[PDB]
Amino acid sequence: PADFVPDSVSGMFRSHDFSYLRLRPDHASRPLWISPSDGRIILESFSPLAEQAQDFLVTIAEPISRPSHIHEYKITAYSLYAAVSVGLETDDIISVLDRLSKVPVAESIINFIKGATISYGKVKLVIKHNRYFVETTQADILQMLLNDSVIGVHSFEIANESVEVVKKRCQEIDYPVLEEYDFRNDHRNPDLDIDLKPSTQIRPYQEKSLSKMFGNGRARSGIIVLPCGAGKTLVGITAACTIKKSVIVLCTSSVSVMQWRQQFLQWCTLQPENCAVFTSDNKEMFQTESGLVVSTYSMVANTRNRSHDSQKVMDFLTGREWGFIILDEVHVVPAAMFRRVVSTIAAHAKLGLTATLVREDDKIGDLNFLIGPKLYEANWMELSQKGHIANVQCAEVWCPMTAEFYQEYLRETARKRMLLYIMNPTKFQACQFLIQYHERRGDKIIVFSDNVYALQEYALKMGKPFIYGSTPQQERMNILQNFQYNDQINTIFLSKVGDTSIDLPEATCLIQISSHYGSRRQEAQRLGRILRAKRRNDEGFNAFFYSLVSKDTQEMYYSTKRQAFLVDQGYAFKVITHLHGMENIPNLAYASPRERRELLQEVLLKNHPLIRKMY
Amino acid sequence: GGYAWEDEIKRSWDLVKVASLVASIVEARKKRTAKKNITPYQRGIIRSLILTLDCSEAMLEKDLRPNRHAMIIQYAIDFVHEFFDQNPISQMGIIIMRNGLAQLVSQVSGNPQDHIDALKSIRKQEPKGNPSLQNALEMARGLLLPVPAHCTREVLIVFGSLSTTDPGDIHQTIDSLVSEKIRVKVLGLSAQVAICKELCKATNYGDESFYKILLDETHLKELFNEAVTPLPVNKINKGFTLVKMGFPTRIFEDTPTFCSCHSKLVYGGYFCPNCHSKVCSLPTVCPCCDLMLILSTHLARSYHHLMPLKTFAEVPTTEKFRSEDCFSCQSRFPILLTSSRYRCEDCKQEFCVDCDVFIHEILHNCPGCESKPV
Ligand SMILES: Nc1ncnc2c1ncn2[C@@H]1O[C@H](COP(=O)(O)OP(=O)(O)O)[C@@H](O)[C@H]1O
Ligand code: BEF
Ligand SMILES: [Mg+2]
Ligand SMILES: [Zn+2]
Ligand SMILES: [Zn+2]
Ligand SMILES: [Zn+2]
Ligand SMILES: [Zn+2]
């Protein structure tokens, strides 16, 4: 910024006027705009070299939003740490950035890349016989690590529990640690001979994801983010198949444990002998040299009360030095005690698999040192147009509450306010009319409702099956099987239980009467259920995703906040003020005033052997 | 046995890294060489074409947007409009192949509108069944039987299938066509067919250039357009004669009168000079005396086919030039080291690139030549 006359409209831009720089004549070809201060990147998706830089930019810059035409990216310290890992130096980044940037890379941006791109590659953490050694390739690091107030060719031991502390210390200090596993030269750990059968097929986007993880030839530790239904299960299977070592899978559900094992058996060639499932039902552990354990975070994260049956398994897990760990739905690993499994379980490589990499609290960034940086992220829109995932016509239906109910809405306290507007009569009519309309079309409908009481009320009146936490595994499976293979039943009423890692290929339509406040991942994960549509390639097919919201209620504040992640991905929500043909439906719930008042009162009222013969 | 993942990363960004005016001319110079060979070949202006279209299962393919049937019919409508515009005194017939049978959809007639209506109706029916060249050729042979000897009997076949099912011997039909002097042009869709090549070759005095296979939709339009021009006649095939036709005079009557062709009341019509009967439109054969009626304009439309304008040869930049502006449009010639002047040898007048295309495509007389007094 030297000798540049401000414009009369420069006042409107509060220090954001970046016109001080000039533009080269080759602006017609260069597809990258760079903000000299904020680090933001604006990418043209309708210009030559778009595909040329679509992969280079993703590696260096994380995506904040990738709508149809103009893609938005931002460069951050964490993003650079991921990029520098895969054989990238400042010189290469600077040379390519200038070759592609319409506007010159400012000194501030140049300074930012220099600082964070030079630290990588001077400290490594290795594991030997369940003993963790902070090995360094140069002796100069001893004067920096051993003298650290937190800690405690040269190699020194470090406590397993202290790993969660030193890794954060590594981020704070200049040198961050990298977890690279040389499986090729690792012979001490017994190998597991498994390869994908010929029937298997590797999709290009998955192939790119695997390449980002096996770029240098040594297994990396990080996170792979793919849209729901992209096939993350096969990505984990391929990673397990190529490493050919002891592996384990952790999932935060019981039904999903069978799903992962079922996919594992069919895709790869692992024999049933080497696979053991550690759940509440069975706890036997494989005695063969090497195998797989598909367990849940609850079983491995428990510390206080472990019984004899589970205690023996825990000793077996801890005693042996494993090679790989798979964390399905890794967006819940940095929790208070779910993160303990990473440290307690010894493994030379860690993989994270979550469709959504966001959470309400600011602990999402902690995944960098719990499991590693972000390796690859796949755009939802690109896969959708390629026929790999289904298209969804997201809609938001506005249901104005009736006057009688709204009268109690103002007075009622917030705690009971939720229950008040969740069972408003208008939403019943919309849900019933939409369900009937889609049932006539021949659509498999899934109804989600976080509130158990509302879920029961909907099902009891509508005479449709409902599933919630109290139901057993056998009953829910029977309901699920009936909903899939039987033509008689085409709609089910699910709850928060099936919000994640559930495969419903036949599901095409989804309705959400009321859900979990401001949570965003719930909105996206639930949307992933209908992204599984088997008939996602037939012409004119469009999955339906509805979110009934009461007008003039806090649900609008929650609804607009929870769907803030889908808009970033690219999905757009349509407002439906009125449903055509809804009045001509023969019967509707609570049509007469008498029935409406009956509902209002009920919801308002909610809150010695000898002696034995005598008797 | 390592996979491709462990080898390396593709690094797509590595692939991309960061006289011309002469090139634009030399291509123009070379293209002028192709069209330099123009001679007054004798052409049969009066034509009798039987348009045969394939409507079979093979035409349901999605190669051409939206499908082969729709595009071929769509181009067929375009062909009729262009054909009759440049061949006013010719007649056309339309046949289609469906269910291994030849279906007549338009009789031989000189009215372009009648053919358009038939083609539009065909656009609705879904094609199906197997094709039959022998059925189509036999029907085409019959349709061309009641044609004078001075007309050129031609058959344009749009074939889409790679196989043909026929009830009889196709070679016998081919021999009959040669005996009848009918000429066959085939526009295939997918690949060469052995019988089609023989049909086009033996039927055109051994020439193998009348069997064309497209490579894209753009080329298909060129193939259809090329058929509008009259086909040069063979030397040893002599059918010279005089044809008796008259030039009627248009009338403007106050009251409507019945037409001798359609028996319908029409205000104005052209009176035949042999029997005074009135005909709604031209050019048509008089419904009473069987005498062809045409206007002087119709004949003049075909003069350029008999006296083609000689090509214009580029002028090298070594020699000096006459004027800085085009003779016909006075469009200043860009200096650009190359020249854009095109000169006509007959008059030696410079012409711009814009006129040269226009003079040889829209007009048919060199502006400089006419101005020049002998
Ligand atoms: N390459 C593939 N070949 C066959 N089916 C695939 C492939 N990739 C994904 N699928 C299918 O996609 C669906 C979802 O797979 P899954 O791994 O459970 O997805 P995610 O865990 O990413 O939600 C399943 O029906 C699975 O068989
Ligand atoms: F992301 Be998936 F639906 F497990
Ligand atoms: Mg999954
Ligand atoms: Zn008439
Ligand atoms: Zn007459
Ligand atoms: Zn000119
Ligand atoms: Zn001339």
Topology:
The structure is cut from a larger assembly and holds chains A (615 residues) and B (374 residues).
Chain A: E1 32-34, E2 40-44, H1 50-60, E3 62-65, E4 70-74, H2 77-85, H3 90-100, H4 107-117, E5 124-128, E6 131-135, H5 142-145, E7 155-158, H6 163-172, E8 180-181, H7 204-213, E9 219-220, E10 222-225, H8 232-243, E11 247-250, H9 255-267, E12 275-278, E13 292-295, H10 297-301, H11 308-319, E14 324-328, H12 340-344, E15 349-353, H13 367-370, E16 374-377, H14 380-385, E17 392-400, H15 403-411, H16 414-422, H17 425-441, E18 444-449, H18 452-462, H19 473-485, E19 491-494, E20 507-514, H20 521-530, E21 543-551, H21 554-562, H22 564-569, E22 574-576, H23 593-604, H24 609-612
Parallel strand pairs in A: 10-15, 10-16, 11-13, 11-14, 12-13, 14-15, 17-21, 17-22, 18-19, 18-20, 20-21
Antiparallel strand pairs in A: 1-2, 2-4, 3-4, 5-6, 6-7, 8-9
Chain B: H1 4-7, H2 12-15, H3 20-34, E1 47-54, H4 68-86, E2 91-98, E3 101-109, H5 112-122, H6 133-143, E4 152-159, H7 170-180, E5 183-188, H8 194-202, E6 211-213, H9 217-226, E7 245-246, E8 249-250, E9 257-258, E10 265-266, E11 270-271, E12 278-279, E13 284-285, E14 292-293, H10 296-300, H11 303-306, E15 313-314, E16 342-343, E17 350-351, H12 353-361, H13 367-371
Parallel strand pairs in B: 1-2, 1-4, 4-5, 5-6, 7-14
Antiparallel strand pairs in B: 2-3, 8-11, 9-10, 11-12, 13-14, 15-16, 16-17
Helix pairs in contact in B: 4-5, 6-7
Bound molecules: adenosine-5'-diphosphate (ADP), beryllium trifluoride ion, magnesium ion (MG) and zinc ion (ZN) (4 copies).
Adenosine-5'-diphosphate is lined by residues 201, 203, 226, 228-234, 503, 505, 532 of chain A.
Organism (chain B): Saccharomyces cerevisiae (strain ATCC 204508 / S288c)
Domain VWFA (chain B): 48-227
Protein name (chain B): General transcription and DNA repair factor IIH subunit SSL1
